[PDB]
Design a protein around this ligand. Structure first.
Ligand SMILES: C[C@H]1O[C@H](O[C@H]2[C@H](O)[C@@H](O)[C@@H](OC[C@H]3O[C@@H](O)[C@H](O)[C@@H](O)[C@@H]3O)O[C@@H]2CO)[C@H](O)[C@@H](O)[C@@H]1N[C@H]1C=C(CO)[C@@H](O[C@H]2O[C@H](CO)[C@@H](O[C@H]3O[C@H](CO)[C@@H](O)[C@H](O)[C@H]3O)[C@H](O)[C@H]2O)[C@H](O)[C@H]1O
Ligand SMILES: *[C@@H]1O[C@H](CO)[C@@H](O)[C@H](O)[C@H]1NC(C)=O
Ligand SMILES: [Ca+2]
Ligand SMILES: [Cl-]
Length: 496
């Protein structure tokens, strides 16, 4: 299962955070497929609680009310339509699966759900599933408040409520079956895998029990015997009793130390410098590459929530952000996920953003459509990082060099480094406060190459910097510390 199930030649998935199904469907056809993206992680597709205080925050989608495919992103018809269209184009769909819990216990009963389904948090009643008091861990948890109070007790992390979220009793076959019914429904529709939300709060064995009940991927699109791609969200920054290695038997795991460390290195915090990245990978204490799902930032930590803390880089830090995503996409470690966000009015008070709950662009709660500007950027406040030339081209760079070994490393002992991927690609970084100008061994065949960061190879010529590689594989690179993007990347497919 540890396989992404993407089409051979596509090495990344993009998280289109809070996008509408019809928009993702269009994007699959007009951009994702043509540009070589392997897949899309979609926000929870199941019915959630409609929260008006604050006004429709992004996190209301992590408070399930039922498993009906009915949310602000669209209905079941639109969802199935999106999966079909995307698949028929070679772009996979991965579902954000919230199976650990239902909504907050403090939520009011009624029908304030994205689909009118009736629910009653207080009496533990969710008739639309259905679920009742018998399906929650209320009696199982032993904390005085019923919530998770101590992360050093691996037992309450699993049996108690993560910040009040009603905890499902995943050891009961009935509950396991209603969750598998939900997931198989999605698999049969055509989804290629799942992000198991809050995997640290579930026992490795209960997860395994559910995965045993899952179908093989839709044979109309996937070869027989295909298993769904599973990546478990486990925030393991060391120090806790629960280790992400405990989950290797169920599938991959999100490596949160990846973005956190890369963040500090590129920001050059407390001594860190890029020259130290020569042995980036397991050498830094990360999980084995073949069990890693990596990223620079995610929906949680890009807004002071998840893990990484203050070192995390996001679109807000555009220049350093493109450099980290660039390094990630060039380096051989793990399977990469690209983030695509929307802008929100950050309002830092006392060093904290009081507007981090703000939901996606909307009009009276109705999510805005993604509009494409003439330069390919997006309107309506969608940042669309996946459409930034520097990022889009590095997505293609990863596809071109897939399989090539890590070689020809160079560093000045400070923050100017470079390395190639076999004889298929080469990348150079200048993160020092002074210019870089030197001739380096690239390992690429002779010729004139287009730098894919500053420009594009527009059949016959380049729109940006051009690099000339000699017969012995050497080439001169010059990067001012004043460049908009302090790094250059060239590959086999950008060769003139
Ligand atoms: C939010 C996060 O908490 C835990 O992560 C822990 C992690 O285990 C621990 O080692 C450490 O790591 C991380 C690092 O963290 C830094 O900060 C520290 O500085 C570092 O030292 C530390 O190492 O701190 C993290 C955050 O406390 C879970 O283990 C994650 O799985 C979960 N993330 C997923 C799960 C859920 C729940 O469905 C979602 O929550 C989302 O959805 C729920 C439900 O809507 C929202 O809860 C909201 O609704 C509930 C309703 O009851 C209210 O009670 C609550 O106040 C309100 O905010 C929630 O805020 C929202 O993020 C997320 O979007 C989703 O990505
Ligand atoms: C490249 O651009 C130059 C003009 O700057 C033109 O002479 C040349 O024919 C173009 N190459 C191709 C392959 O179109
Ligand atoms: Ca739990
Ligand atoms: Cl994640």
């Amino acid at each position: 299962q540890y396989s992404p199930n993407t089409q051979q030649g596509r090495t990344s998935i993009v998280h289109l955070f809070e996008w509408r199904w019809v928009d993702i469907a269009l994007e699959c056809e007009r951009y994702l497929a043509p540009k070589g993206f392997g897949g899309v992680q979609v926000s929870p597709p199941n019915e959630n609680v409609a929260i008006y205080n604050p006004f429709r925050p992004w996190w209301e989608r992590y408070q399930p009310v039922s498993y009906k495919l009915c949310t602000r992103s669209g209905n079941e018809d639109e969802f199935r339509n999106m999966v079909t269209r995307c698949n028929n184009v070679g772009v996979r769909i991965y579902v954000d699966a919230v199976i650990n819990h239902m909504c907050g216990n403090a939520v009011s009963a009624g029908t304030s759900s994205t689909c009118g389904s009736y629910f009653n948090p207080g009496s533990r009643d969710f008739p639309a599933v259905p679920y009742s008091g018998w399906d929650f861990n209320d009696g199982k948890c032993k904390t005085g408040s019923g919530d998770i109070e101590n992360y050093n007790d691996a037992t309450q992390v699993r049996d108690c409520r993560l910040t009040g979220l009603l905890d499902l009793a995943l050891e009961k076959d009935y509950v396991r079956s209603k969750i598998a019914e939900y997931m198989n429904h999605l698999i049969d529709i055509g989804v290629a895998g799942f992000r198991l939300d809050a995997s640290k709060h579930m026992w490795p064995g209960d997860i395994k029990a559910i995965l045993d009940k899952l179908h093989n991927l839709n044979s109309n699109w996937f070869p027989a015997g295909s298993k769904p791609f599973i990546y478990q969200e486990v925030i393991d920054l060391g120090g806790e009793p629960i280790k992400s290695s405990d989950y290797f038997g169920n599938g991959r795991v999100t490596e949160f130390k990846y973005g956190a460390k890369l963040g500090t290195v590129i920001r050059k915090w407390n001594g860190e410098k890029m020259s130290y990245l020569k042995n980036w990978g397991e050498g830094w204490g990360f999980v084995p590459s073949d069990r890693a799902l990596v990223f620079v930032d995610n929906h949680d930590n890009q807004r002071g929530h998840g893990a990484g803390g203050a070192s995390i880089l996001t679109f807000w830090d555009a220049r350093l952000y493109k450099m980290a995503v660039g390094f990630m996409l060039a380096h051989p470690y793990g399977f990469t996920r690209v983030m695509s966000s929307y802008r929100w009015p950050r309002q830092f008070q006392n060093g904290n953003d009081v507007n981090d709950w703000v939901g996606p662009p909307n009009n009276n709660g109705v999510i805005k459509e993604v509009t494409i500007n003439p330069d390919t950027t997006c309107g309506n406040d969608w940042v669309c990082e996946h459409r930034w030339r520097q990022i889009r081209n590095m997505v293609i760079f990863r596809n071109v060099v897939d399989g090539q070994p890590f070689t020809n490393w160079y560093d000045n002992g400070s923050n100017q480094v470079a390395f190639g991927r076999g004889n298929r690609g080469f990348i150079v970084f200048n993160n020092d406060d002074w210019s870089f100008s030197l001739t380096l061994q690239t390992g690429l065949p002779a010729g004139t190459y287009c730098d894919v960061i500053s420009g594009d190879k527009i059949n016959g010529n380049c729109t940006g910097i051009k690099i000339y590689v000699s017969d012995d594989g050497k080439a001169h690179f010059s990067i001012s510390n004043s460049a908009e993007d302090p790094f250059i990347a060239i590959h086999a497919e950008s060769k003139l």
